[PDB]
Amino acid sequence: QNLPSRITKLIKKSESGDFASSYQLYKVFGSKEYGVEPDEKMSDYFKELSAKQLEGGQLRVADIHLENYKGFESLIMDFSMKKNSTILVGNNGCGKSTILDAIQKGLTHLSSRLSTRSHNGDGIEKHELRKGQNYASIAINYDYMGIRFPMIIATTEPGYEDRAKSNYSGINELGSIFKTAHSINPNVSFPLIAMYTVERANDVSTRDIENSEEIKEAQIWDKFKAYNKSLTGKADFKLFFRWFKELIEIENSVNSKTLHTVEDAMYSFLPGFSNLKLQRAPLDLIVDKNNVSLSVLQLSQGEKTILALIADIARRLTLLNPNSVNPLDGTGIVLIDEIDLHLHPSWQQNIIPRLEKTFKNIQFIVTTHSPQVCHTIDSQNIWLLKNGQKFK
Amino acid sequence: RITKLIKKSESGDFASSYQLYKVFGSKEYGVEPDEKMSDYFKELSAKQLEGGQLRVADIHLENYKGFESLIMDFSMKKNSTILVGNNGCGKSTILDAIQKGLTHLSSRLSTRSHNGDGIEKHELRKGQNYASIAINYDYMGIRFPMIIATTEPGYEDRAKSNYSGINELGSIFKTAHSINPNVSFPLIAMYTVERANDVSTRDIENSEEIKEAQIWDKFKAYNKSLTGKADFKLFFRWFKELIEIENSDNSKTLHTVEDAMYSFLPGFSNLKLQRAPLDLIVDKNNVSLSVLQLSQGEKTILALIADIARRLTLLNPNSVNPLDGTGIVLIDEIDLHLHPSWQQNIIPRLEKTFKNIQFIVTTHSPQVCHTIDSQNIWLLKNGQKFKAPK
Numbered sequence: 001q002n003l004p005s006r007i008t009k010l011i012k013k014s015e016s017g018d019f020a021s022s023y024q025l026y027k028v029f030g031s032k033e034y035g036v037e038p039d040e041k042m043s044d045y046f047k048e049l050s051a052k053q054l055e056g057g058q059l060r061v062a063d064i065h066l067e068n069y070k071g072f073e074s075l076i077m078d079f080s081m082k083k084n085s086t087i088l089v090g091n092n093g094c095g096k097s098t099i100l101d102a103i104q105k106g107l108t109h110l111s112s113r114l115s116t117r118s119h120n121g122d123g124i125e126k127h128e129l130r131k132g133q134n135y136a137s138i139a140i141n142y143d144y145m146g147i148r149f150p151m152i153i154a155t156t157e158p159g160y161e162d163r164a165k166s167n168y169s170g171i172n173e174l175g176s177i178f179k180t181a182h183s184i185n186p187n188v189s190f191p192l193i194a195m196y197t198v199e200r201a202n203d204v205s206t207r208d209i210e211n212s213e214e215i216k217e218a219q220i221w222d223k224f225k226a227y228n229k230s231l232t233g234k235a236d237f238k239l240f241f242r243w244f245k246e247l248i249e250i251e252n253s254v255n256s257k258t259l260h261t262v263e264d265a266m267y268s269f270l271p272g273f274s275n276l277k278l279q280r281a282p283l284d285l286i287v288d289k290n291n292v293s294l295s296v297l298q299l300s301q302g303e304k305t306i307l308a309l310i311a312d313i314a315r316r317l318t319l320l321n322p323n324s325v326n327p328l329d330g331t332g333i334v335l336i337d338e339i340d341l342h343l344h345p346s347w348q349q350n351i352i353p354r355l356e357k358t359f360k361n362i363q364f365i366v367t368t369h370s371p372q373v374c375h376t377i378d379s380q381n382i383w384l385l386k387n388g389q390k391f392k
Numbered sequence: 393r394i395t396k397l398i399k400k401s402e403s404g405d406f407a408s409s410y411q412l413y414k415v416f417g418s419k420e421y422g423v424e425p426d427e428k429m430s431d432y433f434k435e436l437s438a439k440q441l442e443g444g445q446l447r448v449a450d451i452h453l454e455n456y457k458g459f460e461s462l463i464m465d466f467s468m469k470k471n472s473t474i475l476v477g478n479n480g481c482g483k484s485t486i487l488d489a490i491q492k493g494l495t496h497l498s499s500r501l502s503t504r505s506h507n508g509d510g511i512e513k514h515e516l517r518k519g520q521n522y523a524s525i526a527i528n529y530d531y532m533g534i535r536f537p538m539i540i541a542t543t544e545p546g547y548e549d550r551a552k553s554n555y556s557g558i559n560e561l562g563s564i565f566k567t568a569h570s571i572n573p574n575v576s577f578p579l580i581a582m583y584t585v586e587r588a589n590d591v592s593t594r595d596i597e598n599s600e601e602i603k604e605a606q607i608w609d610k611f612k613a614y615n616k617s618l619t620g621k622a623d624f625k626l627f628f629r630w631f632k633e634l635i636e637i638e639n640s641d642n643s644k645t646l647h648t649v650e651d652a653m654y655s656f657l658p659g660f661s662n663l664k665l666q667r668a669p670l671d672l673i674v675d676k677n678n679v680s681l682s683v684l685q686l687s688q689g690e691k692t693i694l695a696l697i698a699d700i701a702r703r704l705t706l707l708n709p710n711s712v713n714p715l716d717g718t719g720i721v722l723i724d725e726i727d728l729h730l731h732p733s734w735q736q737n738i739i740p741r742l743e744k745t746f747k748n749i750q751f752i753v754t755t756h757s758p759q760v761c762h763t764i765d766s767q768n769i770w771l772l773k774n775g776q777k778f779k780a781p782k
């Protein structure tokens with residue numbers, strides 16, 4: 001056990017509280033880092049101590065690399081930690097969808113370890129190669145508490161299995177730490193993994209959800225539920241209707257404050273609304289339109305899309321985050337594709353600042369076309385694209 | 393007996409021919425109702441509509457949706473009108489009223505004889521009890537009234553329904569069909585905010601509803617046209633039929649409909665068909681992708697233009713140029729899935745390719761209203777028709 005003074009310094013820092021030192025030492029003991037060599041059988045008091053001191057960490061992507069995916073030949077994107085917002089502006093032909101929907105592939109594999117069954121969700125498909133190459137690769141570097149996590153989703157084509165191979169060596173531990181933390185305590189907060197594609201507005205209506213619509217089955221409202229159907233890109237308002245019914249039925253303070261917080265999440269957004277109630281009789285959900293009357297089946301599609309999006313995000317953050325003062329302060333990644341979809345042009349100047357105002361702990365990697373989306377965004381947050389190339 | 397109105401009897405244009413039915417037929421006011429030249433004039437005013445145009449004159453909305461009362465006169469000299477506004481002002485309400493009137497018009501024009509949609513419970517203003525959707529049509533200078541109005545029961549008939557004009561329009565079109573079985577039926581279609589959504593080839597095969605033989609006639613263009621979905625699967629089936637004939641040649645329709653799509657696209661070419669997986673080939677920048685392998689903005693417009701081209705192709709069978717048809721085509725959210733720069737060429741390409749189609753479109757992007765006449769812009773802000781034509 002050759003112990004440098006750095007080992008003792010990191011040990012003292014870990015006692016004071018720092019996940020980074022704990023995970024670094026858990027790698028050190030059992031390896032050759034500063035010698036030492038395997039001392040304990042496994043995770044003596046280092047990985048378990050990290051799991052105990054697992055709180056407040058943000059699951060944020062830091063570096064992605066595309067190699068012959070979609071129409072590209074090579075791409076090296078660089079996000080940042082101090083800024084919780086990434087906006088990808090370009091045109092149809094210069095792929096920012098091949099950035100968002102290239103990160104969702106790795107996010108599916110992370111979802112299938114974070115809290116679900118361990119299984120490979122998506123891989124690189126033949127309709128994804130650049131019509132003529134044989135090797136493809138997407139690399140993602142998750143950064144939790146300041147420690148990197150490699151990902152290689154590289155595929156192969158027959159006859160060329162020599163330099164491309166998948167390596168899930170970081171997400172095999174990023175989820176294991178969370179499982180250990182959940183073993184330590186049951187009320188730990190897991191991050192949110194979510195993508196929202198162009199199809200957000202699809203299936204947002206109370207058509208027959210008061211009747212046979214496949215939600216009639218009993219529902220288990222645990223922490224693992226919010227991870228189901230998250231990376232399909234469709235906002236679930238029908239399930240929000242089920243949750244809203246259940247919470248108000250129980251309401252008739254801890255069982256009531258959730259709906260108040262979720263509703264105030266929307267009220268801080270698109271204005272003029274208050275006192276949203278249901279219809280026990282076979283009518284539609286009712287919401288105010290500057291205090292006369294209105295229902296949800298009769299709305300504007302900007303209202304509809306914003307309502308569905310924010311309802312889904314708030315409901316998943318409430319499920320994922322256990323009893324806490326502010327359940328909406330959860331961490332994770334929320335991918336919004338085509339954010340400039342059905343919003344009046346005076347909204348595409350406040351949609352992003354309010355998203356990072358109310359839900360102010362989640363990185364938002366969004367894609368847009370209208371320049372007005374960038375009107376409230378610094379120049380360093382913007383990534384222009386042209387002919388498979390990235391400009392500042 | 394007869395005044396100088398023998399002028400209109402000088403075999404005048406369709407305006408005079410139709411005006412010599414209402415008078416000079418029945419009504420016993422002007423000339424004795426002989427009833428013979430009335431039938432002869434109905435027969436005459438069927439071949440006269442060789443180069444006619446169908447537009448919408450003006451609409452009256454009263455308590456339908458948010459609008460308490462609004463009257464706008466759609467200019468007919470210009471073949472395009474734009475309804476710019478924010479969200480919550482009533483751009484789609486104006487379009488949805490015309491879509492509930494065009495349903496009744498298509499019910500008479502198509503092989504249908506029954507009626508269509510109507511005002512229902514939810515689509516009536518909160519507090520009031522009578523609705524009013526009056527759409528006045530014009531066909532070669534003749535004005536055709538319409539009133540789709542219904543009211544809640546218990547009141548002394550404050551509103552009623554009158555369907556006089558569209559019956560006459562359908563009658564004259566049917567009479568035109570009886571003589572020459574190609575009379576350039578006007579196109580009726582709304583394109584809602586949910587175009588595309590079915591422009592993927594992930595599933596198109598023998599396992600879906602597009603498997604039975606479908607009759608290609610001018611009445612086929614009225615199926616699901618007002619629903620608001622770009623029926624790309626049926627276009628794929630039609631394209632398979634047309635390419636099969638070209639392979640059987642061992643057919644200028646395909647060239648025309650394909651050149652219609654290339655014009656709207658900045659460097660797309662060479663649409664062919666894959667036989668094994670059944671998906672469409674497209675060549676951008678001379679690298680061959682597949683129809684599913686584009687952007688949503690490069691697929692929505694592809695489906696939209698392909699659909700419009702095929703509807704005019706079936707609707708004007710024997711015309712030398714099938715795209716020179718007439719219609720009341722509506723697009724909601726034209727700026728959807730478009731560049732800040734492609735929102736410029738979107739209107740002129742429609743104007744050049746479709747020179748006799750009226751486009752009552754809605755948008756909220758300022759970049760769409762460039763190079764467009766200022767007197768065709770309807771800013772429906774608040775609850776009126778505040779116009780900014782300078």
Ligand SMILES: Nc1ncnc2c1ncn2[C@@H]1O[C@H](COP(=O)(O)OP(=O)(O)OP(=O)(O)O)[C@@H](O)[C@H]1O
Pocket residue numbers: 289294298299300301302303342457458478479480481482483484485486514515516517518585724725754
């Ligand atoms: N009594 C009412 N009935 C129906 N709608 C009403 C009523 N009162 C107010 N409204 C409002 O009128 C609004 C209609 O606004 P509008 O037509 O501009 O939507 P839109 O943004 O144009 O839709 P689209 O994107 O499809 O074009 C509804 O959102 C609805 O909230």
Ligand SMILES: Nc1ncnc2c1ncn2[C@@H]1O[C@H](COP(=O)(O)OP(=O)(O)OP(=O)(O)O)[C@@H](O)[C@H]1O
Pocket residue numbers: 070071072091092093094095096097098127128129130131367676679681685686687688689
């Ligand atoms: N397998 C491929 N081979 C060659 N080129 C491809 C391939 N896949 C995609 N491309 C091209 O690369 C471009 C990038 O694709 P994509 O459409 O997803 O970008 P995008 O316009 O930003 O999408 P969105 O509008 O949803 O944001 C496409 O326009 C497409 O033409």
